[PDB]
Amino acid sequence: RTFLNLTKPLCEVNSWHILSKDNAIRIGEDAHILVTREPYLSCDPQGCRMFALSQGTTLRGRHANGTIHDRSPFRALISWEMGQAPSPYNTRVECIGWSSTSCHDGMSRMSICMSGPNNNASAVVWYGGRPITEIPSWAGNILRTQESECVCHKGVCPVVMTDGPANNRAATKIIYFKEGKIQKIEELAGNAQHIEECSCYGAGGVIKCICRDNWKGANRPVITIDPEMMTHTSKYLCSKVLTDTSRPNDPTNGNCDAPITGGSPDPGVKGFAFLDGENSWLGRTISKDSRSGYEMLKVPNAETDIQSGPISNQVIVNNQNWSGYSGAFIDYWANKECFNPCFYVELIRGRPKESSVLWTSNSIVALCGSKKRLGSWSWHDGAEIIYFE
Amino acid sequence: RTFLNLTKPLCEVNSWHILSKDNAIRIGEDAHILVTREPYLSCDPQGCRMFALSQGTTLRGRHANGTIHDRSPFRALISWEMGQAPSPYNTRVECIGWSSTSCHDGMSRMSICMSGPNNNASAVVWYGGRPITEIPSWAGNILRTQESECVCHKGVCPVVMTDGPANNRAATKIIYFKEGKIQKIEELAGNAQHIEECSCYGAGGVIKCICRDNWKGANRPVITIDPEMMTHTSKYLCSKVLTDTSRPNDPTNGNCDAPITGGSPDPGVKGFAFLDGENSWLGRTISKDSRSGYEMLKVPNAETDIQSGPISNQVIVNNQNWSGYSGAFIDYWANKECFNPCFYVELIRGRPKESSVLWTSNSIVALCGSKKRLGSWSWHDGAEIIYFE
Amino acid sequence: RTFLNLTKPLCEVNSWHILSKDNAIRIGEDAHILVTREPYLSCDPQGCRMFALSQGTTLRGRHANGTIHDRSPFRALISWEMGQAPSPYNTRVECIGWSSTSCHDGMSRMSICMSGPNNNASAVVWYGGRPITEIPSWAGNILRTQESECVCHKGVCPVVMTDGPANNRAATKIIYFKEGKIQKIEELAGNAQHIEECSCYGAGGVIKCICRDNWKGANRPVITIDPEMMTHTSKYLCSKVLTDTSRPNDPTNGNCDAPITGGSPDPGVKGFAFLDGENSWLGRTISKDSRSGYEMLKVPNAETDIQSGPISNQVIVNNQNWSGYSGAFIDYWANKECFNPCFYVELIRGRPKESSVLWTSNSIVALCGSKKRLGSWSWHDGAEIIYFE
Amino acid sequence: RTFLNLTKPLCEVNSWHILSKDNAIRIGEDAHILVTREPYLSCDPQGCRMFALSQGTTLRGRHANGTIHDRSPFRALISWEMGQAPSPYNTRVECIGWSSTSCHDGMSRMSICMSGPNNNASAVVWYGGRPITEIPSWAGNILRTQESECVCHKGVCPVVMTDGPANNRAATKIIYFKEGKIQKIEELAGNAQHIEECSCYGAGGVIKCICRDNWKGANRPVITIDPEMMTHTSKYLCSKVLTDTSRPNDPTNGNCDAPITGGSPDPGVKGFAFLDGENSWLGRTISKDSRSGYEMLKVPNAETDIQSGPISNQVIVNNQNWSGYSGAFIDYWANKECFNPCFYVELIRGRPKESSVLWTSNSIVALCGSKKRLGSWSWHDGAEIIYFE
Ligand SMILES: *[C@@H]1O[C@H](CO)[C@@H](O[C@@H]2O[C@H](CO)[C@@H](O[C@@H]3O[C@H](CO[C@H]4O[C@H](CO)[C@@H](O)[C@H](O)[C@@H]4O)[C@@H](O)[C@H](O[C@H]4O[C@H](CO)[C@@H](O)[C@H](O)[C@@H]4O[C@H]4O[C@H](CO)[C@@H](O)[C@H](O)[C@@H]4O)[C@@H]3O)[C@H](O)[C@H]2NC(C)=O)[C@H](O)[C@H]1NC(C)=O
Ligand SMILES: *[C@@H]1O[C@H](CO)[C@@H](O[C@@H]2O[C@H](CO)[C@@H](O)[C@H](O)[C@H]2NC(C)=O)[C@H](O)[C@H]1NC(C)=O
Ligand SMILES: *[C@@H]1O[C@H](CO)[C@@H](O)[C@H](O)[C@H]1NC(C)=O
Ligand SMILES: [Ca+2]
Ligand SMILES: [Ca+2]
Ligand SMILES: [Ca+2]
Ligand SMILES: [Ca+2]
């Protein structure tokens, strides 16, 4: 084994093929399946695994009552074999807490969890299954991180974190790790005005993080990171195709260097994009208002062109079904000439959209790029809420 | 580890001994057992595994309701240790979809799943647990495959696929894979008029696939494949002993080169045969109308002689019990000078034949050849439907 | 790895220490635990495992109804990590059937299961997890074997099998296996008049099997096997201390060469003994009539002296609790200069003795020798039958 | 690959970070989770595991009724992957009994369990999964041991055991093991007047065991062990900060060489401390009467200074929540220059404090030292007792 180096370009992508689906809510109606939210996937030289924040209870259990609540001492980052649903029997605890990221550097896995009260949270950084570093809150307001995978290059794994208000200017930092140890800490610089829940991927020696501006923008901030120099720049996705939720109608032109505001009633959702000239794809909920549906839009030069619009689309989840967070990952250890973009959509079931149940949970679907023009259908959660009533 | 070569002849078979039985429906009455159908077994250097298409629900779960339906976004190919029943806790997801095949080449396992809507399905081809190739539907009508194992020789694994009507001429192809990559594609040639759900095995450098003509024939198509030249020929099993379901009474003579028009009310069922001159064995349901019972018939020269009839028989499942699909596999890595034929029978329970329950599932029984003359009994599913009422 | 040989002597035993207990019935009252009976343990270079014949249903499942019945197509030999209870999720299917034995030769494990109808049963012999040999019934009346571990010496593993009446003269054979292949078959020789369910162990290059005479004797047959010459002799335990169930009161003298009759209402139970001159121990149920209680008695020269009586005792299961079958095993791979005797007791719950439930199952306790004088208590099953009503 | 040597010093500790939490009671309200008590953690070269004494029943099972009872034939030491909750499906049985210790010497794991009746208990000492040695009771009154990990140096692992009354003078021994074999036995010497349930850790070639005086002292006894010379001394923690439960108010001065008595109604609880001059931390329940709350107190020179008081505190469990036993462990195989203190708190639920249920069980939280000043949260058992009514 050797350190992963981000030497390869992104693969050409013309459509998206099915990678995995865990059907967790369908199965968890009867089997012992943990309540989760904030899922993702991350790979290593041996393959890929699903990750999520457990609520420390099963879905049918009486303790599922109240799991709309985001932060508790009963949450933990868990991982499991891709495709399986998360049970108490097949899940690995990565760290304890209510916000996370994880990535493999080619040698071992780094996992990070924040826990604690809102005014006094702390991150614990784990490497190869052991705790290495702890980081106290710097702003006394919910120190928190990506909720999808980090990316490593020559053993250096940058991680984006935020501490401060969700609805105003906050203190975002990029922390550069190696074997779980802090190499360098940078304050956020550039034109992004607020940063949450970054979705990051690497290609051609550059890491790109596509994030959530919870304060103003319905356009997504983009942080571009040089993992060798350990420096970064930031701005917004230039395209007029707005990809946060809630958002207004797409304007005539986007804005590379400032938020495009508007939309109702919610300030943001975790999301992602792959940005590679003509080979650029933006995910978004189909609804401009709610976390419903999910579509992939091929928008050439989305990163640079304020007039860029879609040239193709693929519906991943139809607009009659619930979605949620979405994020980027790549199997960097695949036997391929290029790094092939993948993504997941979190399929939220229960509260607040479905208030006939006392709980909130999700299932997962994941897809990767194809150079072919593949047919598509909706990969919605598939559980019947009435069965849980 | 090296590539498997089909260098051995088939073992002499006089009797069939019990290999495995999972008793999934009996166990699943109380334990967390996934709803399945279209099962099979496939082996590798280390041992043998059971495979099936999950319905993404447990048997006692409320989502078992409606599982008569063949195609949904909640289906997946799953595999598990031979003999165990399939639960959410002991199963590996091989790929996502509603039609599959899988085989080990001696180095790693190739698995293929079709998914998507009827008019726009796609295959994803996996190797060593990673996605390698995607294949779009070529005829826009349920792109689909074997529902039992493929077979490999010197790294080349041919797979039979069909796209188009189930009740008319369709577009069948033989696709030759190596490490999940397409080496060659041939259109079906020869005298077989319709091809579904091929059951395939190898011996003496030749692969034979015994299939289901869903259009006209109650006699089964036979495809003979040279995996070195990557060429094939096709025709029908010659024997008067007709092996599809439904079928009419066995005629005075079979027909090597044309379908013999069937019985009532089913157009076909997946089945298999081992064809080796005198050492030839044909499986079929005992009922000529329906998926009930299962028998093995030794029919010397079934492949070449229209007058060939049985010289011995073994009842596998009595005709008072439900059967289903059946298929071939071989433990190619056994410590034996010959390749010993094995088969499974899918034991279907619930709908449509048992409509007092809302679900359709199955269990599995598997047997392999013996040179001895062994006694037999019926290996029926064994669950009491009344318990599920 | 190397083939095990049996050159070492038996360790001195002055009392018995607890090795394992699975509490299967206690746990299975509310967890998914398989119905079993006929358990045992067997070891290999890595450790020891528990074995039993599953009934192919959970204990709380509706299919547990009727599990008094000994033989069905839904039974299989399952193994699992010592001390765990047997669930559908942690058990390995060794083979399919309703009578078994198993042993490790130092290189791989051999497992044998009989299945089929009473008049036409057959054994399948597995080695290293693959089927090797099949053996048809020779007398047409429930071909059957030890229900505890066999024993191997320099690759040769003898197994005692019986085919014929349970209540009169039957056809017993010793079959000598190597790598699952038949080396030699011998008809039973000597003065034992009937043989069932042998409990076997090795020491000093010799295998002793202590069996059950179901026809006449309340004293136990003893078969002495030389695994190098592949020959055997047979007689009865000489001691006046009678160890089958049912049995009469112990007489003033035993009989080395004929069955001692008497006892009511049961013709026999599987049991065991370790016979090593002054270092000899006999197990038996505490009740003379019924399968209740269990005691270990140190009976110097039990194998050779008709007047031999106990010089020490250890109650293993008190006489207010149900026992069942018992048998011998040894960890032949321990880091010791001698082979230390171990045994298990099957703790039967449910029918026929506990008729308030519809099922029959068991749990397991296992103990090994100590040279120390250890205190003792009763290791009964521990479940409350009322909880299952 | 090598025997652990206790060469490294203790790391500097300024606050405590979360390591693991299993949330067993919350999860076990619906999933199949074993009833336990007396938990701990122990690590090896590969990772850390949770340990506890099972009660041989699940929490929702009818057999959970009466599990306040400490000693039965149905208890066993089980271990499982750190962070998971203990189920019948993911737990390894280490040994059978109702008092235990375990530790890894760098090569293999030693586990010890006591079992049997009060007047005649015995220990069985296991090494690398096999039984090695048995020790009969020397005082005929509940032979018993640490209930948390032992510590090894150059293959020698000392273990503190007690036999005799809980409420008067008893017979304590230190037994030095290597590969599970007794190297030396010492009678307790020094000023400690009664010893129970030692919590032990090593640093700089010295092992320090912080114990429970159940006879007199509310201050904790401290046994100091030289694992090379295999010798020891004993006394009490000097600090006026009393750390047993029940205890009186902290006096003006502690006493290094004799018990500080008082407190009501209970004579003791298992506890721990790390003692390293200025770098010294004492755990205790927040309540001086009952097993509620848990606090860590930095008490410089607690081991040597009768006037030493706290200079910092961290609430681990709030005083509105139930706690229980606590103990020391260290990941001796961490990639760090110093050994980092860790500890766990047992979070007892059910009887006798919560008598609305018929059972007694626990969950686990574990924390390790940080050199940082981290914020803190209460890590209580998050279950709602009403859900179990
Ligand atoms: C314990 O298990 C054993 C295995 O050792 C099992 O063996 C089986 O026994 C039966 C006979 O009992 C064998 O049955 C034979 O099967 C063939 C083929 O049958 C299929 O096809 C025919 C035609 O379509 C169907 O009617 C039939 O239902 C099957 O689907 C038949 O051709 C055989 O018929 C001949 O033998 C009969 C006597 O056995 C005659 O009565 C009959 O007239 C036929 O005779 C002619 O051929 C004989 C040569 O086989 C010859 O001896 C005669 O002189 C004459 O020319 C027959 O029905 C079956 O193959 C065996 N299976 C295996 C795997 O070995 C035992 O029966 C069972 N024992 C028990 C229960 O105690
Ligand atoms: C039985 O097995 C033992 C243990 O493997 C063999 O012991 C070896 O004996 C030879 C002398 O015959 C010594 O040189 C070796 O050092 C021994 N090996 C060990 C690891 O103890 C023994 O040879 C075997 N006996 C037979 C006849 O097979
Ligand atoms: C148990 O099985 C017997 C025999 O089939 C049947 O009479 C009875 O109804 C069954 N009882 C239950 C409760 O399933
Ligand atoms: Ca926004
Ligand atoms: Ca047909
Ligand atoms: Ca008898
Ligand atoms: Ca005390």
Side-chain angles (χ1 to χ4, degrees), chain A residues 31-32 34 55-63 65 67 71-75 88-93 95-98 115-117 120-124 126 128-136 181-182, chain D residues 17-21 23 25-27 29-33 44-47 60 81-84 87 89-90 331 333-334 336 369-384 387-389:
Chain A
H32 299 150
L34 291 163
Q55 289 274 17
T57 178
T58 60
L59 181 67
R60 280 309 203 164
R62 282 173 182 164
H63 301 277
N65 174 19
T67 51
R71 294 174 300 282
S72 87
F74 325 122
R75 295 205 87 172
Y89 315 128
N90 71 329
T91 46
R92 170 182 292 145
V93 181
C95 44
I96 306 302
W98 42 243
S115 78
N120 226 5
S122 60
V124 186
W126 292 65
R130 293 176 144 102
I132 314 294
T133 303
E134 313 78 45
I135 305 165
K181 301 168 212 132
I182 296 171
Chain D
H17 76 81
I18 190 60
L19 182 76
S20 194
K21 192 183 192 296
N23 297 295
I25 307 302
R26 285 176 54 86
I27 291 164
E29 186 279 329
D30 175 58
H32 298 155
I33 299 298
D44 62 47
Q46 268 60 61
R60 278 297 202 179
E81 175 181 296
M82 180 178 72
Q84 292 177 339
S87 71
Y89 320 126
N90 73 328
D331 186 3
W333 298 271
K336 288 185 190 168
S370 173
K371 211 173 173 99
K372 311 284 169 77
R373 257 79 180 193
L374 303 177
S376 76
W377 227 8
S378 180
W379 296 102
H380 44 100
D381 177 80
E384 292 297 314
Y387 289 160
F388 290 92
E389 297 172 9

Side-chain angles (χ1 to χ4, degrees), chain B residues 17-21 23 26 29-32 44-45 81 83-84 87 89 331 336 370 372 375-380 382-384 387, chain C residues 32 55-58 60-63 65 72-74 88-89 91-93 96 98 115-117 120 122 124 126 130-131 133-134 136:
Chain B
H17 78 83
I18 189 68
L19 185 74
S20 194
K21 197 189 186 296
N23 295 294
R26 285 172 59 84
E29 189 280 329
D30 180 51
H32 299 152
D44 60 51
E81 188 175 296
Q84 292 188 334
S87 78
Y89 317 128
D331 180 9
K336 242 170 258 184
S370 178
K372 312 285 176 72
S376 61
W377 65 352
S378 174
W379 296 98
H380 39 94
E384 304 258 46
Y387 289 159
Chain C
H32 301 152
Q55 290 279 17
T57 178
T58 61
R60 276 305 203 167
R62 292 172 170 162
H63 302 276
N65 174 18
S72 81
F74 327 121
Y89 319 126
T91 46
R92 171 181 307 151
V93 182
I96 313 299
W98 43 243
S115 81
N120 221 5
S122 58
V124 180
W126 293 67
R130 292 187 142 103
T133 300
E134 316 76 47

Side-chain angles (χ1 to χ4, degrees), chain D residues 212-219 244-246 262 266-269:
Chain D
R212 165 184 170 173
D213 174 347
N214 209 61
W215 183 23
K216 295 175 177 183
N219 52 342
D244 209 350
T245 305
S246 304
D266 299 323
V269 70

Side-chain angles (χ1 to χ4, degrees), chain A residues 210-211 218-223 235-244 254-258 260 272-275 280-283 299 301-306 308:
Chain A
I210 288 56
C211 318
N219 54 344
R220 292 192 176 285
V222 180
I223 304 168
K235 58 199 286 172
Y236 286 79
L237 269 179
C238 299
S239 176
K240 66 200 191 183
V241 182
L242 300 181
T243 64
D244 210 351
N255 196 146
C256 305
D257 295 291
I260 299 172
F272 81 95
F274 288 95
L275 301 176
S280 297
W281 285 88
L282 315 188
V299 4
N301 307 306
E303 193 176 10
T304 61
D305 180 9
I306 62 174
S308 64

Side-chain angles (χ1 to χ4, degrees), chain A residues 213-214 217-218 244 267-268:
Chain A
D213 170 355
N214 209 55
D244 210 351

